[PDB]
Amino acid sequence: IITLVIWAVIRIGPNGCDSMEFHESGLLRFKQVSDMGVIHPLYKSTVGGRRNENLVITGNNQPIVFQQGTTKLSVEKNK
């Protein structure tokens, strides 16, 4: 019973759970959308992107503010 509960809560199928997989080189890939909340990169964490691809940092009806102390770079919907 508890093994079925473990199988079902992570929603594991014959291929595996519909969340992620561990690529054998260590590359933690994911499979769908992610809501990471706050993020605090500590050590050697350069937010990049895939080759021949464009980072698309969009705020869905929300501003984007690059802040540092007083300095602000605010990209709102119309300013």
Partner: protein, 45 residues
Amino acid sequence: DWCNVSLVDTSVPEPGILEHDPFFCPPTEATARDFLADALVTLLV
């Protein structure tokens, strides 16, 4: 006026790239795998 007479002769008066290197940003190389044949083995035993 002879006082402001000026003489001049010849003399010898003789007085772009862009590049930045980051460290790394490689993507998911060798993007292919499957989880059926091993699943078939471990569910066929």
